[PDB]
Amino acid sequence: GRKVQSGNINAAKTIADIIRTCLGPKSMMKMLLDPMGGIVMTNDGNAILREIQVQHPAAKSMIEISRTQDEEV
Amino acid sequence: QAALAVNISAARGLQDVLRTNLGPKGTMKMLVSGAGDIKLTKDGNVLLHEMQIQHPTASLIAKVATAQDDITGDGTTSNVLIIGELLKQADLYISEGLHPRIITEGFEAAKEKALQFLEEVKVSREMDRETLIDVARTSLRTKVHAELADVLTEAVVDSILAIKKQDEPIDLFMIEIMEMKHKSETDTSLIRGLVLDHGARHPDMKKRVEDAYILTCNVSLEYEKTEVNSGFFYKSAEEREKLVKAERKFIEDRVKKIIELKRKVCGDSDKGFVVINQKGIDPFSLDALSKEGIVALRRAKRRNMERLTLACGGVALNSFDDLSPDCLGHAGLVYEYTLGEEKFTFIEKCNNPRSVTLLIKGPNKHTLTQIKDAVRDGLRAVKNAIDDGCVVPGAGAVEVAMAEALIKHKPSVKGRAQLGVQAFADALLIIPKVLAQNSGFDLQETLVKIQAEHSESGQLVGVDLNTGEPMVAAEVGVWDNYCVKKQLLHSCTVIATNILLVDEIMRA
Amino acid sequence: QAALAVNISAARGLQDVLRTNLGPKGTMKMLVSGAGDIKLTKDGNVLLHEMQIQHPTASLIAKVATAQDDITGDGTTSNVLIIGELLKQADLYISEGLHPRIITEGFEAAKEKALQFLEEVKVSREMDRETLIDVARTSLRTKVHAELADVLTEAVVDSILAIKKQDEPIDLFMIEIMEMKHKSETDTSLIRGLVLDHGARHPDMKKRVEDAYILTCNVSLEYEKTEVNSGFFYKSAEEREKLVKAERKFIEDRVKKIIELKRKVCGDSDKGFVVINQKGIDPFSLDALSKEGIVALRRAKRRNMERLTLACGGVALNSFDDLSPDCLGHAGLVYEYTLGEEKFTFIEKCNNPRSVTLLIKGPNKHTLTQIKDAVRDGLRAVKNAIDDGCVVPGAGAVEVAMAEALIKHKPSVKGRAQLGVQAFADALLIIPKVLAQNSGFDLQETLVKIQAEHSESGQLVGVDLNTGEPMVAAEVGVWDNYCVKKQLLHSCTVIATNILLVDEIMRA
Amino acid sequence: GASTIRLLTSLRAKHTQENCETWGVNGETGTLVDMKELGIWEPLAVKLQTYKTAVETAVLLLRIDDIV
Amino acid sequence: EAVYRNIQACKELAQTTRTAYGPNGMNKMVINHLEKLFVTNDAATILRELEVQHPAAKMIVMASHMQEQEVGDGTNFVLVFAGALLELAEELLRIGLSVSEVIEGYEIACRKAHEILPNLVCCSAKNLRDIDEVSSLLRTSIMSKQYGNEVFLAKLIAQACVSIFPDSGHFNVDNIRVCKILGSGISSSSVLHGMVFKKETEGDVTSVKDAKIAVYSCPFDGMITETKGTVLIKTAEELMNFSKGEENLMDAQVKAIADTGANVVVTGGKVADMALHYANKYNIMLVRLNSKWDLRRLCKTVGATALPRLTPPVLEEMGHCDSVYLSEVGDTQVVVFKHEKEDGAISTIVLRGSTDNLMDDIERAVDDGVNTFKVLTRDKRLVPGGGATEIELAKQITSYGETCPGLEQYAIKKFAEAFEAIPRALAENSGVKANEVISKLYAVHQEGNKNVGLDIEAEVPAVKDMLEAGILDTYLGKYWAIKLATNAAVTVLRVDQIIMAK
Ligand SMILES: Nc1ncnc2c1ncn2[C@@H]1O[C@H](COP(=O)(O)OP(=O)(O)O)[C@@H](O)[C@H]1O
Ligand SMILES: Nc1ncnc2c1ncn2[C@@H]1O[C@H](COP(=O)(O)OP(=O)(O)O)[C@@H](O)[C@H]1O
Numbered sequence A: 001g002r003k004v005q006s007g008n009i010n011a012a013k014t015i016a017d018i019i020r021t022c023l024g025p026k027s028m029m030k031m032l033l034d035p036m037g038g039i040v041m042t043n044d045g046n047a048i049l050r051e052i053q054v055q056h057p058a059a060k061s062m063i064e065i066s067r068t069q070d071e072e073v
Numbered sequence B, C: 001q002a003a004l005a006v007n008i009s010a011a012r013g014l015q016d017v018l019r020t021n022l023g024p025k026g027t028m029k030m031l032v033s034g035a036g037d038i039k040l041t042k043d044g045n046v047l048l049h050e051m052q053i054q055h056p057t058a059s060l061i062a063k064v065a066t067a068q069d070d071i072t073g074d075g076t077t078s079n080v081l082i083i084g085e086l087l088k089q090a091d092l093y094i095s096e097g098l099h100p101r102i103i104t105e106g107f108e109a110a111k112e113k114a115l116q117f118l119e120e121v122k123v124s125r126e127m128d129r130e131t132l133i134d135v136a137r138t139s140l141r142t143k144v145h146a147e148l149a150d151v152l153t154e155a156v157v158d159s160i161l162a163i164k165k166q167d168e169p170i171d172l173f174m175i176e177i178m179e180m181k182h183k184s185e186t187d188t189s190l191i192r193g194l195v196l197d198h199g200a201r202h203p204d205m206k207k208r209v210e211d212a213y214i215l216t217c218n219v220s221l222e223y224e225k226t227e228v229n230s231g232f233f234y235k236s237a238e239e240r241e242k243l244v245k246a247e248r249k250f251i252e253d254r255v256k257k258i259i260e261l262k263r264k265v266c267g268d269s270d271k272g273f274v275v276i277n278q279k280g281i282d283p284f285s286l287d288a289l290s291k292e293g294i295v296a297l298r299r300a301k302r303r304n305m306e307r308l309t310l311a312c313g314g315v316a317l318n319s320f321d322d323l324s325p326d327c328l329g330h331a332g333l334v335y336e337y338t339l340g341e342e343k344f345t346f347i348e349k350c351n352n353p354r355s356v357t358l359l360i361k362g363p364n365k366h367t368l369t370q371i372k373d374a375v376r377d378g379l380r381a382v383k384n385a386i387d388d389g390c391v392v393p394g395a396g397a398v399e400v401a402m403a404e405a406l407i408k409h410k411p412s413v414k415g416r417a418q419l420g421v422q423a424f425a426d427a428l429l430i431i432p433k434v435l436a437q438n439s440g441f442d443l444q445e446t447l448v449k450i451q452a453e454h455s456e457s458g459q460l461v462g463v464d465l466n467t468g469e470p471m472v473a474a475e476v477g478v479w480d481n482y483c484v485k486k487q488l489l490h491s492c493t494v495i496a497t498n499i500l501l502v503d504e505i506m507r508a
Numbered sequence D: 001g002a003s004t005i006r007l008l009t010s011l012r013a014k015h016t017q018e019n020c021e022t023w024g025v026n027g028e029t030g031t032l033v034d035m036k037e038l039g040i041w042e043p044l045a046v047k048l049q050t051y052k053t054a055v056e057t058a059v060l061l062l063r064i065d066d067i068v
Numbered sequence E: 001e002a003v004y005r006n007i008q009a010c011k012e013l014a015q016t017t018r019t020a021y022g023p024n025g026m027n028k029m030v031i032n033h034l035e036k037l038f039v040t041n042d043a044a045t046i047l048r049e050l051e052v053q054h055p056a057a058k059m060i061v062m063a064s065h066m067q068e069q070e071v072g073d074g075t076n077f078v079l080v081f082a083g084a085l086l087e088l089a090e091e092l093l094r095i096g097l098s099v100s101e102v103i104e105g106y107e108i109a110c111r112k113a114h115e116i117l118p119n120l121v122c123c124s125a126k127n128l129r130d131i132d133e134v135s136s137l138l139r140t141s142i143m144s145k146q147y148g149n150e151v152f153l154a155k156l157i158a159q160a161c162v163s164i165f166p167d168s169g170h171f172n173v174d175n176i177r178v179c180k181i182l183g184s185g186i187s188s189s190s191v192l193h194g195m196v197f198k199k200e201t202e203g204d205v206t207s208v209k210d211a212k213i214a215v216y217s218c219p220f221d222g223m224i225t226e227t228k229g230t231v232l233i234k235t236a237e238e239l240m241n242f243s244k245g246e247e248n249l250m251d252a253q254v255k256a257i258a259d260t261g262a263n264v265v266v267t268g269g270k271v272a273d274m275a276l277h278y279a280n281k282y283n284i285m286l287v288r289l290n291s292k293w294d295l296r297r298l299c300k301t302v303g304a305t306a307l308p309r310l311t312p313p314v315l316e317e318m319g320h321c322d323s324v325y326l327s328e329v330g331d332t333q334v335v336v337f338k339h340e341k342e343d344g345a346i347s348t349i350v351l352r353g354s355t356d357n358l359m360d361d362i363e364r365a366v367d368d369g370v371n372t373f374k375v376l377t378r379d380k381r382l383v384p385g386g387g388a389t390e391i392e393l394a395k396q397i398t399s400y401g402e403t404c405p406g407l408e409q410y411a412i413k414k415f416a417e418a419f420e421a422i423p424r425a426l427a428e429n430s431g432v433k434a435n436e437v438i439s440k441l442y443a444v445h446q447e448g449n450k451n452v453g454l455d456i457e458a459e460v461p462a463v464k465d466m467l468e469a470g471i472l473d474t475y476l477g478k479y480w481a482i483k484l485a486t487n488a489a490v491t492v493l494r495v496d497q498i499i500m501a502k
């Protein structure tokens, strides 16, 4: 249980906590605060994933494997 | 929950900003740009269009609310205010273990009840002069002075009565606005036809051209010098130095063409024939044209040309000769008019007069933009009022009516959505109480008085804004559009939904 | 100056501290004394004596709540929550510029309606043992571990049944709870008659004595020729030898007084007279009278003697001498109990045996003190139940019914007191609300559910903490006292006014 | 907005009973429903791919050590 | 918030107490307000010194004290098990379940455990004679506190208890005293009928028949109530005159006050050696260098009572005995008082060892052994220990949780996992990783063997049957340990805030 796996898990938990509310017919709206000043609304998780900033390399690799998932199906 | 609370707080802040604007007796806001020019506006749509707001979610609320409110006249002030109150009421339970979705479905059920309630609460009244006077009043008084609005009502309603003959929901094809500075603002009147902001260098014109034949083609009575002969400044520019001249003949040739067409269409030199130019025209030949019964005008803008074509016939073209009278129109009176310093020639009583225009005469820019916005609001509101067959009284009347209807509907909706319909009822209650607050009659006292008046009698009763007493809004003459208020409730529910569902702030 | 905001915040804080404590399912709280000892408790009476109240007007609310609840003592916590919710809605309505005094007037009108409607909520019946044990159970379970409450409740209803002849209230003289530290609670039931603070034992002494007569003695071995009992005359030899005389002289004379009393009255001590000696005594009396009929008791306090004076007839004559053989008290049965480490004397079937005692016995210190406070509160609640045959359904049922009644009475109330009674109803909503939160339900669906159940039918439905679903509290057996509810409404309204009417809080 | 723990626990208890494998949660109303009765359905292939890729990305991610 | 704080405090208390659980428990340094330093692996002492200032910690500690005063073994089991309860309740609350549900679930799970555990028992204690069998029964308790040298203490305790355990089905807790005279070798310990003392002033025992005892911490007078005689140390010659005087008074004691019950005087304070010589001449012995508890024990076991200051003796405080004689156990003089059940019911052992720290370790071992004998006499059935009973209960509680629909099942499953925490406590102390051994133990235990547990002797995580291995706890011990552990857990969970009062 080294710190690197803990960081991997923490990044996965953060991104999954962001995405969770987008599941189901009653899914929540999400807020995208582009530092230019505008806001992008979204209902589903792929749209928020395509432009969410992930500075942590673990979350970035999670995004890459999500890209690998979504390109297939 | 923190992001939802932040969004609610920002929406409440902009709600408090817009709180004081609603109602005739309501304090104004005026904007200043980087250049420093002021902009007086109690309107909500242009306000949210032009405001600089520090918050984000406020920005999205303004953008989406104005975009969806433009479709439905002007109601975004009440929209923002009611959604702010609805967010307050939602938070008053979100702090107590309420999940946004159940509150949202409560709002949805309240909306489903409220639309069907307004269906039978709107009164089926025949459109006539008086009801449209009333709706024009209730629109204009929300943007300008009461006496000034009273002045506006006649013109703004009579233009609509003129265009009503088409009996179809068609707008903005005519009834364009016309602006000019003047010493006294009180003068502001409609003009059948169109107004030209210019005249010509015609000393001692037969200004009262009643037999005004019209054919609005561009006549080159000031030929643009042919500087381009063989390109730019090569050695062949010696041709350009001399070919730039000798354009004097074309002016008189075109004038002879106008004289020939004048002879063809009138058979004499008596009846006035009116023609236009996009560019300037010489005065010397205008001296003879005024004697020939020919009225050429210069410096015309673009869209006005086809507007004259649609209102009085004729065609507009840049290439000019003695064109065949295949489209000759006839204005019944080109009322050449001038006051102050500038000549504004009127065109009225066109043959089968299609178009109308509203001459607004604001003294200066910051009042002129205000009067412009007021006229647009009034015209679009009365257009909505003639679009639907029923007009519903306002002044917080139907708002308290549907709030009490939702209170009675509380048991009918099953489950935890009851708080949703309760909060929606309070959001509707914000309107009469905010009118009372803006007028100053201890908003909650007026709210309880109006609810007591409604409950005891069942009559659709509103707030008498100038005295606070509860009064029948139908009898007082306060009318709101059914379409505007329908889309108002739609927008309220939709944006309240959106704001409850958002729960996270993303740095991206 | 909304200086009342800090008072409302203090009410919020005290409400939160008194939150989580309602119902059997709710949590309890511990009071860490300055000495570092432990004190577990659940009742708000002693929780409002937690001298770390941390804020002055919170201390005001605590002390006034204790003062106004000491009359009934079944309704103290709930009071804090109702006043907290009244002040929550009051803050919600001050935040729009509304003046608090009309809010207090609305609260007063709401109280006037609520007491009248409560007078119809209450059920009236002859207090049979089944309903009595049900109300004792529902009053005591909200303060004790559920598995242990019932064994106490049976002894409680027995205690209150022992004094049914006359409408007189609870008095400690007929119910004296007595405690001793032990390994296990093991049926902490009452004993009929009186129990002594201690006992005397000797291997030849008698365990059970029947038809025992009783007297007391403040001085039987200490002083001679004087009534004083203090430090011996070490400073005066002339008065010192009388104090070594005293023991021999009185263990002679007064012991023969006892034996001639028992011989003449009983026919040679056939009825076994017993004596309560107030303090220590030479073992000559104890270890020899064990065979000489007499049961000599040791180390008993005075309160025991006044209790037995009321409990056995005659008088506990502190002067030893048997000046009248009919001045004796009488006991029907006597049992020198011994359990765990210590020994105690029971006296039973005495003349006027309506006095009983509670053997509140269990784990040491804090559990014992909590049991003592809980049984005292249960006895006072069953006192309230007996004093008037009126009983109200608890478990939030009465608050739901009152809330609905005030909602229905709301349109009848003139003016902003309509809003006041709305605030009062939404505040009374808190008891179902706190109960539902205590057992960890959604809590906002419980309230809607219970209101829908109370609106569809006329049943006095309240929340059942074991299921959350609405169910008629009447046949479940979760009763409550009508008198404590009346006092609850009165105290709540009066202190909600007295706290909401603060303005410009200033130091003394 | 339903009881996230209570009603899910009821769903699990239902799933402890045979032939109740179809029983599920209604996303539209937030209550337990025999999802065969609603008629809202879902194919085998997408779920197989979803679980396969989920465990695959878990395996990939928690095996990582991050070094420039 | 405060619930999590209380859980964290009790978690750290149970963690710092857990390392001493099991036979191979880890010692810790103890520095009480006497500032003496010694190493011990006993929950009772380690908590008695450890200032548990957190009120929840104090609650669990006093629950452990109540368990200890009711039943001998399991005082550390209560700590570790309440800690497991609170950690798993913190997990449940982090899931989001309310305190009421978890406490009610713990209560019903405790009731189920108390209902099913009597079915869990596998053997019952035979007759308490046959020192070998009772030694085998004390085996687990004796090994629990001391390891490496274990059979000797089991035999010692067995002999001590059986030599005094009466024919009646009763035995008293304050029976076995310990004497801790220093010297080489633990194995040199022995048992004597009646009470013994470490070492005192020399004397020739004449009270070997009809022994009676007087006890003075006051001037060495011992006059009879019918005469006046005293010693006042102010000058030498008359001091000798008094010494003669109270020696004659001691003779008058052994003559007449013997009828009341005084022959030999117990002196709290030191007396002159020449006075000791006079005592030798006139045939009266005495004892010296005894702590106040020693005087209390000697007087209570004879019916006497220590006098704080000078007072003529009366029958109220006389002591009765059969014999006072002497033995050089461990090559050192020790006095012994022997009884023939006139009062009796007392037996005392001599502790042998080279350090007072090891002396106290032996003392706690003896205390736990004699308390185990207590709880075995009144409840002769007793439970297979060493992790076996905790895991059998854990499996049964898991089955019950799967049997219970709806809520309350979280608390049932976490109560079973609290059972699971016990062999984890054995594993960490025994040098084997907890997860592997607990999983292997489930593998061998869900098969129905029902008597498998953590094998300490194996260097690799493995299991063996504790029944034939001799590792087995008392039924009532574990019953009350779990009962008050669950009571402490449910009471501490029922505190949502820590509040101070004046
Ligand atoms: N003379 C009046 N008396 C009372 N209420 C009025 C009057 N005129 C307008 N109102 C109220 O103003 C409300 C809407 O006005 P407002 O929202 O400010 O216009 P807009 O949205 O176009 O900026 C209506 O509900 C109407 O009842
Ligand atoms: N068995 C029960 N089930 C549900 N609710 C109960 C039960 N017993 C009491 N209550 C409710 O709990 C409240 C009484 O307890 P409580 O307010 O804590 O007394 P106190 O003022 O002495 O602290 C009442 O609102 C009553 O309706």
Ligand SMILES: Nc1ncnc2c1ncn2[C@@H]1O[C@H](COP(=O)(O)OP(=O)(O)O)[C@@H](O)[C@H]1O
Pocket: E020, E021, E022, E023, E025, E042, E043, E044, E072, E073, E074, E075, E076, E077, E140, E141, E143, E144, E145, E368, E385, E386, E387, E426, E454, E456, E471, E473
């Ligand atoms: N030989 C052993 N092998 C495994 N576990 C043991 C053994 N002996 C004792 N134990 C465990 O230790 C417990 C009792 O010892 P412990 O709790 O550590 O100290 P105490 O008896 O003073 O509370 C027993 O309940 C049992 O679970």
